[PDB]
């Protein structure tokens, strides 16, 4: 369906064409750069999803510690 790799590749393609358009160049001015941008976008999206998972995992442990400290007050 809709995966991180696909969204990232599409966003990398969009960035290169957006960058070409901001410079008033043709959309496909340097197409190898479009290939590079798709690759980079896919890499970045997969890494971002993995990083989000790791961050949630770490936040769970830290909230566990916070709740333990707060529950210490009622002893």
């Amino acid at each position: 369906p809709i995966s991180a790799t696909m969204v990232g590749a599409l966003l990398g393609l969009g960035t290169q064409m957006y960058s070409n358009a901001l410079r008033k160049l043709p959309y496909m001015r340097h197409p190898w750069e479009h290939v590079v941008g798709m690759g980079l976008g896919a890499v970045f999206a997969n890494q971002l999803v993995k990083w989000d998972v790791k961050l949630k995992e770490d936040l769970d442990v830290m909230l566990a510690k916070a709740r333990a400290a707060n529950e210490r007050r009622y002893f």
Binding site: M28, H30, P31, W32
Partner: protein
């Protein structure tokens, strides 16, 4: 159509990539000649599928510009500095017709001012130096004077003559055997039989002069001038 235009566009992406690759290969070998400013002028230029079709006997000067759908017949000639643009509509030139130096035969660039009329040039027609023909029709054996301007919708009938420097306004029909001149062009006098003989003899002569010019331009490019330009200090 759309599929051909998509393929033409994707081909440009592959070509631009290949040309960049070639430039990379030269940069690795320390060659910079790809940076030389060389003229990109093409005598016959295409706009996607619209390309000029030129008879093998028709002389075209190397500095002339023939753009888009432009038909040139046998024995015709396009002289030095001439510009023929056939993008928004077609330009057709009949057999044995001379377009003299620096002439412009073009169609309307836009349809804002109405449907874009094509330009039709008949057979054995003389178009004088630096004349401007824009979306008109010129019938067989007519004379267009040097520096004349024919706007769109103008009909020049057979054996009709437009004097030099005449501005023929839009939709102005020049009847046969009539000399029209001035700004705007109006009837001036009736054409004489000697003038008709001179018209035909002139077009026959220009076909023979064009043959001469087409031969000297065909000469192999001098390697001596090439070496002189290369070795300048």
């Amino acid at each position: 159509g759309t599929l051909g235009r998509a393929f033409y566009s994707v081909g440009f992406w592959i070509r631009e990539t290949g040309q960049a690759l070639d430039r990379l290969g030269c940069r690795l070998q320390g060659k910079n000649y790809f940076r030389e400013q060389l003229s990109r002028h093409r005598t016959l230029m295409n706009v996607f599928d619209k390309a000029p079709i030129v008879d093998k006997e028709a002389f075209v000067a190397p500095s002339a510009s023939v753009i888009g759908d432009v038909h040139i017949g046998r024995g015709s000639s396009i002289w030095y500095g001439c510009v023929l643009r056939g993008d928004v509509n077609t330009v057709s030139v009949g057999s044995g017709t001379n377009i003299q130096d620096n002439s412009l035969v073009h169609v309307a660039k836009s349809n804002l001012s109405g449907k874009v009329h094509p330009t039709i040039i008949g057979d054995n027609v003389t178009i004088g130096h630096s004349a401007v023909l824009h979306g008109c029709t010129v019938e067989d054996e007519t004379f267009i004077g040097m520096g004349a301007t024919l706007l769109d919708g103008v009909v020049v009938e057979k054996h009709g003559m437009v004097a030099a420097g005449a501005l023929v306004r839009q939709n102005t029909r020049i009847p046969s055997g009539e000399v029209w001149g001035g700004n705007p062009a109006r009837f001036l006098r009736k054409l004489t039989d000697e003038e008709i003989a001179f018209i035909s003899q002139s077009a026959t002569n220009y076909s023979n002069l064009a043959q001469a010019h087409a031969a000297e331009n065909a000469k192999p490019l001098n390697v001596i001038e090439f070496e002189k330009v290369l070795r300048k200090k």
